[PDB]
Amino acid sequence: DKAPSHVPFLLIGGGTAAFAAARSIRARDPGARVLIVSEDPELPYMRPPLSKELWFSDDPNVTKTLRFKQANGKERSIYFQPPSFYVSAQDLPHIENGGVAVLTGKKVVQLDVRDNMVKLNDGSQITYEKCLIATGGTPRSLSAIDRAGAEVKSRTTLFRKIGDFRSLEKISREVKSITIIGGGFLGSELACALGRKARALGTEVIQLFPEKGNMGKILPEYLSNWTMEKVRREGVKVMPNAIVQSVGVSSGKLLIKLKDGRKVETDHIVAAVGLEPNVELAKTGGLEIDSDFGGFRVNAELQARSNIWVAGDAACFYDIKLGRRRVEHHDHAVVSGRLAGENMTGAAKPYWHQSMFWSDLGPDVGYEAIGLVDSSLPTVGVFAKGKGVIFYLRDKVVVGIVLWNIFNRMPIARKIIKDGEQHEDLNEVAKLFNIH
Amino acid sequence: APSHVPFLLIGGGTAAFAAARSIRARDPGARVLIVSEDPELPYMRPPLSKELWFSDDPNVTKTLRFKQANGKERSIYFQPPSFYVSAQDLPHIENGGVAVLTGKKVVQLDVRDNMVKLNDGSQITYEKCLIATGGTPRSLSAIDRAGAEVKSRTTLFRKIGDFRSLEKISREVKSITIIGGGFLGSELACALGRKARALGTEVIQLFPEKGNMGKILPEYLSNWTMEKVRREGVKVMPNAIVQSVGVSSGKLLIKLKDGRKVETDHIVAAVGLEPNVELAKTGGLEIDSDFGGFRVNAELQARSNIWVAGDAACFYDIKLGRRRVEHHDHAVVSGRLAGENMTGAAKPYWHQSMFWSDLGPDVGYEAIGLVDSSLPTVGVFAGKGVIFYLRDKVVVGIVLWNIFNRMPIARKIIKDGEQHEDLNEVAKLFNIH
Lengths: 436, 433
Ligand SMILES: Cc1cc2nc3c(=O)[nH]c(=O)nc-3n(C[C@H](O)[C@H](O)[C@H](O)COP(=O)(O)OP(=O)(O)OC[C@H]3O[C@@H](n4cnc5c(N)ncnc54)[C@H](O)[C@@H]3O)c2cc1C
Ligand SMILES: Cc1cc2nc3c(=O)[nH]c(=O)nc-3n(C[C@H](O)[C@H](O)[C@H](O)COP(=O)(O)OP(=O)(O)OC[C@H]3O[C@@H](n4cnc5c(N)ncnc54)[C@H](O)[C@@H]3O)c2cc1C
Ligand SMILES: Nc1ccnc2ccc(F)cc12
Ligand SMILES: [Cl-]
Prior knowledge:
- The structure is a homodimer.
- The first copy, chain A, contains 11 helices and 28 strands.
- Chain A is of the alpha/beta class.
- Chain A is globular.
- The interface of A and B includes residues 286, 343 and 348 of A.
- Bound molecules: flavin-adenine dinucleotide (2 copies), 6-fluoroquinolin-4-amine and chloride ion.
- One flavin-adenine dinucleotide binds near residues 14, 16, 49 and 355 of chain B.
- The site of 6-fluoroquinolin-4-amine (QDI) has 8 residues of chain B, from helix 6 and strand 24.
C-alpha cells in the first residue's frame, strides 16, 4: 500500500499501545484519520496468548487460526481487530468519516520534529499533525550466544512475535530437548507451555537462570521458591543459580557450559532475558532518553514535545504518585496508549489509573500485580487456603501488590495504592482480598 | 486579584517580565497577571552587585538608577509603573495589558483545576501558567549551626533590600567578609573594595577553591583573577573551608578547617542558589534530582498548560543535554521562549543565552554554553583572550576575557558543532593573534 503524504494522527509502531491509541482517538474524534506504521507484516495483535493460551488450545489448527478461548470461555483472535475494521492507507484521506489504516512492512527510520514529518525505510515521507511513538522494545540476547557461532545463533529463539510462536511450536514437535534461558515471567510461561507439550510427546524441557528461583527479581524468596516447584511439576527441569559461560555445538546438539561445573545438552535454546526499548528515533528527532530506566523520557501526560507522545514499553513517564518509571506490561500498553490518544485529542490527562499485570504459570498458578513490584523492596505477605497477597512497601506505604490466585479484586489493590495510607496492620488490609 | 486570568506568571522577576512582553507581542490583546511575593515591581538584579555600587550619585540607594556602558542612565526596573495596568482593571481594560500583584505569594498549585491559591486565601484560575519562581540563596551549615547573633550579622545578597542593607553596613562597620568565590562573591568584593578604599575599611573574601571562580575558570586564569581582586583592595583567602563561626567580644570569629581564624564585623554568604520548587509538591510536578529545579522538556513545558523558565527551570537542551542555567540573559531568553510557546510557538530552546561578569573596571568576562573548570580547556591570550571548553572533541563552552561585541561569534561556534583542527585559528575570530 502507498502511504499518504499527510495524515492527522500518525502512530509509529503497530502493537498494543498503538492500537489502543487508535481506538481512543477514534472514540473521541469520530471522523479521525489515523495511520499506523508497522515494521511487522501483521496487523496489531496482543502478545500474551503467544506464551499461554495458544499452547493450551484444543484446536489442532491453532498455529494457523491464532484463535483461543478466554477465561470467560469465549473464543477470539490474537488480533485486536479483523482486517475489515481497518481502511487502506491510500484511501484514508478520502473515506467518509475517516478510519484507521495500518501500513505494514514499513519502518519509520527518521523523525523530523520541527517539520512534523517522518521518513520510511523506502524513502516515503509523511507529515503529521500529532504523532505517537509506540515502538515497544527488542528482546535482549546473551553475550555467550553472541560470542557463539552461526549455528548456535540459528538454533536460538528470541520469543516475541507470531513467527516465534510458530517456529518454536514446530520445533517442539521435532526435537527432544529445548532449553529456556531466563527466570522471568516469559521464560516461566514458556516452560509450562513446553512442559505440557513435552508430557504428551515424552520430550525434555529445561529452564535455567541465575536467580535462586523463578521470578527471583519480582517475588519474595519463599514465593519464588514455591513457584519453581510448581514449574518443575509441569514437567520442567529447572536449574536455578545458573550463569551461562559459553554455548557450542557437540555432535549436532547444543552444549551449554555454566559458570559452575554443570553442563547442559539440548537441541534448541529459547532466550527470554529481557527487553531493550526501541529508541533509535530519538537521535534524528532530538528526543531525550532516560539513562536510568531507558526509553523515551516523557512527562505525566506521556508527552515528549508539543505534538509527540510516547506510550507502551518505550515510554519512560512520570508517575505523579509512584515517580518516574518505565513499564513493560500488556495492560500498561493499553492504558498508556488509550491515555495518549485522549491527550492527542486535547484531554491533557496525567497517568493516574494504574495498569495491572498478570501471569499464568499453568492452570493452577495465577498471578496478578499492580504498582512497584520488586523483590528488593520490603514485603509483607499474607496467605491462606493456596492463595495470598504480597504488599510491597516504601515510605511506610503500599506501592505494589501481588495477588496469588486471587482474581477480580485488582480494583481493590488499585485503590489501596492510590489512597497511600500508612496501615497499622496489613492483615486487616488482607481481608479486603478475602484472606482470613 | 481577578478570579480568572488567561496568562498567569508565578514570580515577578526577569523571566516573568520577559514572558509577559513576549506574550503581549504575539497576542496584542493578551491579559497577563504576574504574581510576585516581593513588594517591588519586576527589576534586573545584575546592577545590585555592580553598577549601583560605582554610581557617583549619593542618592543611588533611593533612585536605583545607574549609567550603562553606553552611558545612558536607566532604572533597575524593567518598566515604569505606568507601563502596567492594575489587577482590578486587567479583566476589563480594552486591549488587555500586564498587571503585577505585588506582595502576594502563590502557596498552592492545583494543576487539575488550573488554579492557584495565594497566601491570603485568594484563588485564581488560569488558561496558561508560567512558573518563574527563581531561587533562594543558600546558607552555610556553619552559619546555620551558629547562634542568632551570627545569623543576624550574615547577609544573603539577592534583592534590593540586600543591596540597601549591605550598603548601609559598609558605611558603619570596619570589616566585611565575603564567603564564596563565585561571580557574585567576587563582584561584591570588588564593589566593597572600591567603597572601602575611600573609607579605609577592610574587605575579606574567602572560599575553598584555589582562586576566584575556581569552579568556572581554569586554574591559571582563576589565579590571575584573584590577583586583580586583591588589587581592588580585597584580602583574598583561597583554600579556606569554614569549620565554624561564632561571636567573640562583639566580633565575628570565623574558624577554618586548616586552623586559620578570621576576625570580621559582618559576613556576606554568596555560596550558591536553591531553586524555589516548593510548588512542585502540591502541583505534582517533577523535580530534577541531578540539577534541581522543575524538570521540563526542550520547549520549557512541564504539563499541558504549565511552563517553567529562568533559574528554576531544568530543561532539555537538544544540543547540550539536560541543564539548569542561572544567568540573567537566560531568564530573558527562556522567559521570552516560554511566552512564545504559551501562545502556540512550540519552539525548543535553541538560541543559547550568554552570561557576563565585571570584576572592577579592568576585568570583563563574557561566556556562553557549558563552562566548567572540570572540562578540558584551551586558552589563547594576547590582557585579553578566549577559553574553549571541550567535550566529544567539540567546543561546548567559551569564555571571553576582555573581548566584547563578539558573543554571536562564540554562539555560532557552539552551534556548528565542528571538530576544529586548530583552536588558535578559531581564536582569530575573536581578534586574538
Ligand atoms: C510472548 C509475550 C507474552 C507476554 N505476556 C504478557 C502477559 O501475560 N501479561 C502482561 O502484562 N504482559 C505480557 N507481555 C508484555 C506485553 O505484551 C507488552 O507490554 C506489550 O506488547 C507492549 O506493547 P507496545 O505497543 O508498547 O509494543 P509492541 O507490542 O512490541 O509493539 C511495537 C511494534 O512496533 C514495531 N516497531 C518498532 N520500531 C518501529 C519503527 N521505527 N517503525 C515501525 N514499527 C516499529 C515493533 O516491531 C512492534 O511491531 C508479553 C510479551 C510477549 C512478547
Ligand atoms: C546580585 C545579583 C547579581 C547578578 N549579576 C548577574 C550578572 O552580572 N550576569 C548574569 O548573567 N546574571 C547575573 N545574575 C543572575 C540573574 O539575575 C538571575 O539569573 C535572574 O534574576 C534569574 O531570573 P528569574 O526570573 O529566573 O528569577 P528571579 O529574578 O529570582 O525572580 C523570581 C521572583 O519570583 C518570586 N517568587 C518565588 N516564588 C514565588 C511564589 N511562590 N509566588 C510568588 N512569587 C514568587 C521571587 O521572590 C522573585 O521575586 C545576578 C543575580 C543577583 C542576585
Ligand atoms: N556576574 C554574576 C553575579 C551574580 N550571579 C551570577 C550568576 C550567574 C552568572 F552567569 C553571573 C553572575
Ligand atoms: Cl566554606
